[PDB]
Amino acid sequence: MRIENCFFCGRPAWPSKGITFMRNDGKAFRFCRSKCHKNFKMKRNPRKLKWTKAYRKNAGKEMVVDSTLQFAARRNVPVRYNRELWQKTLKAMERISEIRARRERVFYKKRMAGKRAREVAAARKLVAENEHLLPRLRGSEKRRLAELAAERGVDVEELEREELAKLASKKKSKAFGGEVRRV
Amino acid sequence: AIADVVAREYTIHLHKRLHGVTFKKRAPRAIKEIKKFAQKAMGTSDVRLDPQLNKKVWEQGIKGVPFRIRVRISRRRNDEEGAKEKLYSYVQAVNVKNPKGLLTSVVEEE
Amino acid sequence: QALEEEEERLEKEGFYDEDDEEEEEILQKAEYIREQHALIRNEAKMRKSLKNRAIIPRKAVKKPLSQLEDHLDQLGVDTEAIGLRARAQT
Amino acid sequence: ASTETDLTKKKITPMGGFVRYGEVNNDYVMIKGSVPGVKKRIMTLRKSLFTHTSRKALEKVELKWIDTSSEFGHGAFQTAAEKKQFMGTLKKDLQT
Amino acid sequence: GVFAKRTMTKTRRRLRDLDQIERDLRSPRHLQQYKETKAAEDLPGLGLYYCIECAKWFESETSLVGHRKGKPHKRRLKQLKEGAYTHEEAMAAIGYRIDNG
RNA sequence: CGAAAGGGUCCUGUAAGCAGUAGAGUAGCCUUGUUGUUACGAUCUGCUGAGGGUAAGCCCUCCUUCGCCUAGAUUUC
Numbered sequence: 001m002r003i004e005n006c007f008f009c010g011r012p013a014w015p016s017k018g019i020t021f022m023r024n025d026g027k028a029f030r031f032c033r034s035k036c037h038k039n040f041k042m043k044r045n046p047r048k049l050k051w052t053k054a055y056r057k058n059a060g061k062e063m064v065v066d067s068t069l070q071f072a073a074r075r076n077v078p079v080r081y082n083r084e085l086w087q088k089t090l091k092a093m094e095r096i097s098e099i100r101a102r103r104e105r106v107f108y109k110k111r112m113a114g115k116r117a118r119e120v121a122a123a124r125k126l127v128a129e130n131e132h133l134l135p136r137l138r139g140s141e142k143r144r145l146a147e148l149a150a151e152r153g154v155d156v157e158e159l160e161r162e163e164l165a166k167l168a169s170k171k172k173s174k175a176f177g178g179e180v181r182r183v
Numbered sequence: 184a185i186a187d188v189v190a191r192e193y194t195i196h197l198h199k200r201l202h203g204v205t206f207k208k209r210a211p212r213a214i215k216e217i218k219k220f221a222q223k224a225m226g227t228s229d230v231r232l233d234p235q236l237n238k239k240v241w242e243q244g245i246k247g248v249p250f251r252i253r254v255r256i257s258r259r260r261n262d263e264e265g266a267k268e269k270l271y272s273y274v275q276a277v278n279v280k281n282p283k284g285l286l287t288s289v290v291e292e293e
Numbered sequence: 294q295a296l297e298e299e300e301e302r303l304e305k306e307g308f309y310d311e312d313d314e315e316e317e318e319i320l321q322k323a324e325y326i327r328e329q330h331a332l333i334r335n336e337a338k339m340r341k342s343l344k345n346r347a348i349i350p351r352k353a354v355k356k357p358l359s360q361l362e363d364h365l366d367q368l369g370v371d372t373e374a375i376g377l378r379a380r381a382q383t
Numbered sequence: 384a385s386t387e388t389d390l391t392k393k394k395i396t397p398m399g400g401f402v403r404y405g406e407v408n409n410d411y412v413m414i415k416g417s418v419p420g421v422k423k424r425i426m427t428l429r430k431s432l433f434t435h436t437s438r439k440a441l442e443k444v445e446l447k448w449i450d451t452s453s454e455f456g457h458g459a460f461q462t463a464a465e466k467k468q469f470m471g472t473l474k475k476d477l478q479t
Numbered sequence: 480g481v482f483a484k485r486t487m488t489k490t491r492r493r494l495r496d497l498d499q500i501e502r503d504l505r506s507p508r509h510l511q512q513y514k515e516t517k518a519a520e521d522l523p524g525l526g527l528y529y530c531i532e533c534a535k536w537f538e539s540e541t542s543l544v545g546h547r548k549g550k551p552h553k554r555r556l557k558q559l560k561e562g563a564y565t566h567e568e569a570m571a572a573i574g575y576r577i578d579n580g
Numbered sequence: 581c582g583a584a585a586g587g588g589u590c591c592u593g594u595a596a597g598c599a600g601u602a603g604a605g606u607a608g609c610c611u612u613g614u615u616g617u618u619a620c621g622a623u624c625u626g627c628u629g630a631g632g633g634u635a636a637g638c639c640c641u642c643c644u645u646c647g648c649c650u651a652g653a654u655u656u657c
């Protein structure tokens with residue numbers, strides 16, 4: 001037996017999975033699932049449906065030009081069986097899988113490089129627009145820290161930043177409404 | 184170890200409690216399962232829901248109950264004379280950024 | 294062997310190598326601002342029911358002094374230095 | 384769950400576990416066809432009362448592949464490594 | 480509007496595929512095969528008025544020139560300009576090739 | 581044991597927002613056209629197999645949290 005691939009989405013088709021459409025011109029279409037089969041019957045384009053490997057290859061989100069992807073092919077010329085050849089082939093598939101995975105990770109990082117700069121720019125714009133929503137001391141807290149600093153001869157800024165650290169550590173949420181007292 | 188007066192914040196997964204329920208009964212059923220959740224959590228048969236919590240449950244119609252809700256349940260002493268139950272729960276809606284990803288947390292008394 | 298020689302080559306010119314406190318602070322501040330925006334939106338969605346009925350005007354409802362002092366204290370205004378008790382009616 | 388022609392080292396439990404059962408961590412029996420019970424149900428296995436008369440009882444079974452994909456849906460992957468190899472790198476992979 | 484929209488996905492209500500339409504446009508032998516699978520006496524306009532891109536027969540040249548100005552024909556033209564999905568593109572999506580020696 | 585949470589497994593199909601010498605064309609200001617420029621503008625592209633859901637009869641978690649417990653009542657050669 002072997003592993004086929006879905007015509008529509010490219011997922012691996014294992015035995016007894018999906019369905020095959022036999023066309024009168026002589027073409028077989030293997031679908032891994034009824035989702036792909038029904039999209040095919042509705043004549044949807046896999047290149048336009050964004051969840052498909054065809055769309056991802058067309059959009060350039062799959063690593064396609066790479067030396068590790070040239071090892072797997074449909075071999076139409078059979079080779080006489082050789083035990084050492086099959087064992088060294090198995091070792092080759094394992095090493096090729098490791099190399100291909102780590103190259104794919106490098107490819108994805110090269111795709112996703114600019115996110116940090118975009119997020120930093122957006123954060124700077126949001127902070128500059130909404131400086132007034134940053135956490136601050138209460139009026140009673142400022143009064144009590146000022147009187148404690150006056151009593152102890154300490155820095156009001158020091159007590160203010162210590163209380164800011166404490167309030168940043170202790171996060172509390174607010175509840176809607178409130179109980180009405182019975183008479 | 185735990186005193187009679189204690190408040191905690193919970194996340195109620197109302198989606199699995201309202202799965203498959205008739206559309207005209209989903210919001211009253213959600214109110215009933217909130218009462219049942221509070222009774223099972225705090226041991227009090229007397230459960231009182233905030234009207235803002237009722238508004239939050241009924242916000243999207245009779246069949247638009249949110250999947251998850253963040254509530255605060257407060258067990259308080261019932262000081263009225265001739266009381267069958269000495270404790271009761273009061274359940275409120277909690278203003279949070281997003282109700283997912285939160286744990287059950289004890290609300291500080293101060 | 295060609296794949297291997299390419300692999301140590303790519304290691305030689307560093308094809309697989311991997312790479313600020315002010316930046317982290319500004320992302321944390323932006324996240325706090327977004328959380329505050331979400332809380333404000335949730336408050337508005339709680340207090341608005343404009344599909345079925347109109348919101349009562351603010352001038353027709355008299356505000357509690359405790360709520361006003363709590364909101365001004367949260368905003369950072371000393372209520373004792375301005376004396377809201379005299380301004381509050383009875 | 385590995386055969387002589389399928390060298391993938393894997394156990395009998397499908398991806399995500401058996402639906403409404405869990406995982407099989409003990410010895411298991413593979414039986415051709417269907418059996419009268421349902422999941423979680425106790426079953427009694429018994430020797431046949433008579434000597435068999437069919438060639439099928441004397442046949443030797445040679446398995447080539449055992450399905451271990453998810454039965455919680457249209458599972459197309461036998462192993463989580465196969466699933467990650469097909470999917471590639473995800474957003475949460477860099478976020479972690 | 481689609482006639483009998485309830486059962487338009489049935490196999491007996493199936494229409495010609497876009498890759499078959501591309502091969503019909505590229506090769507007249509393929510179009511000849513498809514036309515000999517039909518009877519000329521049952522076709523609209525005796526089979527003399529046929530749009531290959533829509534893969535559909537018409538009663539008259541006036542009707543054919545008429546539908547050419549419509550949006551379904553322009554939709555078919557845009558789909559053919561984009562190119563139909565094939566097994567070669569399906570293999571290229573996953574990086575699969577045929578080794579013939 | 582229960583309630584959350586996390587991970588997995590499935591389902592859908594790429595979130596809100598921002599940006600763009602992408603965008604048929606139209607209208608303004610001037611270098612009067614040399615992406616002239618600015619504005620609007622279905623849509624497209626990128627951040628983004630992302631967002632959302634996931635047991636209600638899915639799986640795992642002495643090892644991620646919080647809570648509960650050796651009851652009460654009735655009857656019995």
Ligand SMILES: [Zn+2]
Pocket residue numbers: 006007008009010011031032033036
């Ligand atoms: Zn498929």
